[PDB]
Amino acid sequence: TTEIHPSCVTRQKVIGAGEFGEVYKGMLKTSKEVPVAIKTLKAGYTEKQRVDFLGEAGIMGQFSHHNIIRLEGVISKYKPMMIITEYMENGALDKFLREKDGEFSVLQLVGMLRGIAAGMKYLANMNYVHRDLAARNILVNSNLVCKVSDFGLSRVLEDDPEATYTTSGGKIPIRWTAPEAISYRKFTSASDVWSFGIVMWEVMTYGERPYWELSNHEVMKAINDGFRLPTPMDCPSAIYQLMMQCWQQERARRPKFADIVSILDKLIRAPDS
């Protein structure tokens, strides 16, 4: 990661805040200034927290792709510590699609899915398994470009610092996670492809919550009994068929992300479907 000089960074507007810290909109001088998001580490912290905060930035900094959020740099030597990323004017996809209910064409929605799939193909080619692929972790810019991110919603601290038992390795998003990853913690790019099919269903419902009528255990039983998410209204058959292939029980049968990009490219270049 690049260390950013604090003089080059300006915070202008608060986007959100929690016990983790805060997120700001601001400007960065690379030398004209560019808009950025600025994630801060809350005071005070623990040396695992600070190393984990910086270590997550190190992971993000390894990637360079149009459909992966870009790391501009970090401030680690001064307080508050900061992760400084590319700015995404439309925020998280799930919220964006609920705000824009019914307002996009099918070709526009499929273009979003292609962008997500192209980001995931890059990650797969880097041997990176995301494990939390969901519309809430897809960011959207003004041009409607969709980019993969992982703010770390799965890794927030909710464990007492003195608890005998703690969560380790993060919590699991059951509604987005492939069955073999829930059962054996077998996380692979193939289990990310299952999650991608769930993202496809989020997009085509303009942000419905998957299995929303069902408790987390109600979801797991429904799945192993063979239930799959239903065909959204106005979802083309070819898109729903792609979803079902991502949700194949045997992971060796799911498409690879490279295949998903190609399938979506061909559809975009020739509707029908």
Ligand X SMILES: CN1CCN(C2CCN(C(=O)Nc3cc(Oc4ccc(NC(=O)C5(C(=O)Nc6ccc(F)cc6)CC5)c(F)c4)ccn3)CC2)CC1
Indicate which residues carry an active-site annotation. Answer: 132
Whether 246 contacts 182, CB under 8 Å? no
Closest to 264 (Cα-Cα) out of 150, 119, 166, 140: 119
> What does the DSSP assignment read for 127-160?
T---S--SGGGEEE-TT--EEE----GGG---S-
For residue 234, state whether it binds ligand X (rule: CB under 6 A): no
Only segment of 74-82, 104-112, 148-156, 253-261 that touches ligand X (CB under 6 A): 148-156
Total residues binding ligand X (CB under 6 A): 27
17 is in an annotated binding site: yes
Q: What part of residues 19-38 is at the interface with ligand X (CB under 6 A)?
A: 23, 37
104 annotated ligand-binding residue: no
Structure tokens belonging to residue 130: 């995301």
198 binds ligand X (CB under 6 A): no
Query: Of all helices (H) and strands (E), which one includes residue 35?
Result: strand 34-41
56 interacts with ligand X by CB under 6 A: yes
The token pair that represents 76 in the structure block: 């680690």
In the complex with ligand X, the residue whose CB is nearer, 121 or 175, is 121
Give the dihedral of Cα atoms 151, 59, 49, 7; nearest 10 deg.
-80
Q: Which of 152, 154, 222, 238 binds ligand X (CB under 6 A)?
A: 152
Q: Check binding of 148 to ligand X (CB under 6 A).
A: yes
Spatial strand order of the sheet with 91-92 comes to 91-92, 138-140, 146-148
Q: Segment 89-128, which members bind ligand X (CB under 6 A)?
A: 89-91, 99, 123
- Interface with ligand X, residue 150, by CB under 6 A: yes
CA–CA dist 93, 213 (Å, integer) = 21
82 binds ligand X (CB under 6 A): no
Q: How far apart are alpha carbons 134 and 173 in whole angstroms?
A: 9
Q: Binder to ligand X among 20, 87, 194, 196 (CB under 6 A)?
A: 87
d(C-alpha 175, C-alpha 266), whole Å: 29
List 4, 9, 28, 57, residue binding ligand X (CB under 6 A): 57
For residue 74, the minimal CB distance to ligand X (Å) is: 9
Residue 153 binds ligand X, judged by CB under 6 A: no
Residue 18, marked binder: yes
CA angle 175, 100, 245 (to 5 degrees): 40
Q: Is 262 helix (H, G, I), strand (E, B) or coil?
A: helix
Q: How far is the CB of 155 from ligand X (least distance, A)?
A: 9
- State the binding site for ATP: 15-23, 39
Q: What are the residues binding ligand X (CB under 6 A)?
A: 15, 23, 37, 39, 56-57, 59-60, 63, 68-69, 83, 85, 87-91, 99, 123, 130, 139, 148-152
